[PDB]
Amino acid sequence: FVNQHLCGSHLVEALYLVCGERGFFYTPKT
Amino acid sequence: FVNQHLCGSHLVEALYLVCGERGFFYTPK
Amino acid sequence: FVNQHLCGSHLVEALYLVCGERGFFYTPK
Amino acid sequence: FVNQHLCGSHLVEALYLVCGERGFFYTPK
Amino acid sequence: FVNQHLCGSHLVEALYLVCGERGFFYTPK
Amino acid sequence: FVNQHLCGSHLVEALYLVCGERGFFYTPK
Amino acid sequence: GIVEQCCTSICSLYQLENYCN
Amino acid sequence: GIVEQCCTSICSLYQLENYCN
Amino acid sequence: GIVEQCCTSICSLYQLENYCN
Amino acid sequence: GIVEQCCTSICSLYQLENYCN
Amino acid sequence: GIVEQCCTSICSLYQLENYCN
Amino acid sequence: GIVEQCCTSICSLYQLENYCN
Numbered sequence A: 001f002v003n004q005h006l007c008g009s010h011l012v013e014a015l016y017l018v019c020g021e022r023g024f025f026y027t028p029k030t
Numbered sequence B, C, D, E, F: 001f002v003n004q005h006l007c008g009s010h011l012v013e014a015l016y017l018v019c020g021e022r023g024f025f026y027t028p029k
Numbered sequence G, H, I, J, K, L: 001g002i003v004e005q006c007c008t009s010i011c012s013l014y015q016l017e018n019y020c021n
């Protein structure tokens, strides 16, 4: 099941909300 | 304003889709 | 402003929930 | 199941974005 | 894996669409 | 009004995340 | 189409059902 | 509650409507 | 309430918390 | 179909385009 | 930046890919 | 990274903030 990929989708929405005008770097693999 | 805030929400989703394993930097600016 | 584009994004989510196992065509125009 | 339900929700959003003006057809089997 | 959390996010979206102007209470408890 | 409808969809997702275990009460009227 | 019909006034889930296969 | 009802198996839109104000 | 407050300008996270239970 | 192809592993954007009209 | 470029008129996924890492 | 930390167990918004610019 594609769980990590679907989880990442929610993670970026949560970063968008919390980081505000700072923005964020999403770096899945690292 | 709110329109840009809502738009930004969709932008991050489209970036997530298109950037794949690379990821992305989002800066409202 | 990209309002039709953003609306369509919400529309397809609504159609997904309403249509269930029937599925749907989305044909903008 | 649930899982497949949640997955389909993300699938329709990706189709919306990648298909653009073409639109798409979502048919869970 | 945080599927209850992820399921909840989709659940509130679905509730939002079903409830309309009625609104809703969401309690995970 | 669709604009309010789309905004509300984003509102409930943000409330979902920020309220955590408390949950929330969405009452647009 | 659906965008014209549903992007100014809200289409209910009941109305949206007409677009299902 | 709703998480137990609706995250183990899929709730229909009618079942969801239970939770409206 | 939330629509008049948060759909007309961007609400902070603390402002959104007013609507938590 | 799409659920079998794309919920068990990650579909590329090209694979998703199969389902465009 | 991205908001200026893409919130007034639509950006394709190809245009958005400019913002990837 | 974030996927390891946050897709296995739930991260709070405070925890997620560590990934902001």
Ligand SMILES: Oc1cccc(O)c1
Binding pocket: C007, C010, C011, C014, E017, F002, F005, G006, G007, G008, G009, G010, G011, G012
């Ligand atoms: O009229 C609409 C527009 C977008 C989503 C929806 O559920 C209804």
Ligand SMILES: Oc1cccc(O)c1
Binding pocket: C017, E007, E010, E011, E014, H005, H006, H007, H009, H010, H011, H012
């Ligand atoms: O049972 C559920 C859970 C999440 C969304 C939905 O439409 C149904």
Ligand SMILES: Oc1cccc(O)c1
Binding pocket: A017, B002, B005, F007, F010, F011, F014, I005, I006, I007, I009, I010, I011, I012
């Ligand atoms: O004012 C708002 C409106 C929608 C989402 C959000 O986080 C804030």
Ligand SMILES: Oc1cccc(O)c1
Binding pocket: A002, B017, D007, D010, D011, D014, J005, J006, J007, J009, J010, J011, J012
């Ligand atoms: O395989 C998938 C599943 C969901 C979204 C996506 O872009 C790809």
Ligand SMILES: Oc1cccc(O)c1
Binding pocket: B007, B010, B011, B014, C002, C005, D017, K006, K007, K009, K010, K011, K012
């Ligand atoms: O121009 C845009 C704005 C938001 C999402 C998107 O896919 C394109």
Ligand SMILES: Oc1cccc(O)c1
Binding pocket: A007, A010, A011, A014, E002, E005, F017, L006, L007, L009, L010, L011, L012
């Ligand atoms: O741990 C997580 C995973 C995904 C979204 C989120 O808000 C928290």
Ligand SMILES: [Zn+2]
Binding pocket: A006, A009, A010, D006, D010, E006, E010
């Ligand atoms: Zn999801």
Ligand SMILES: [Zn+2]
Binding pocket: B006, B009, B010, C006, C010, F006, F009, F010
């Ligand atoms: Zn939106």
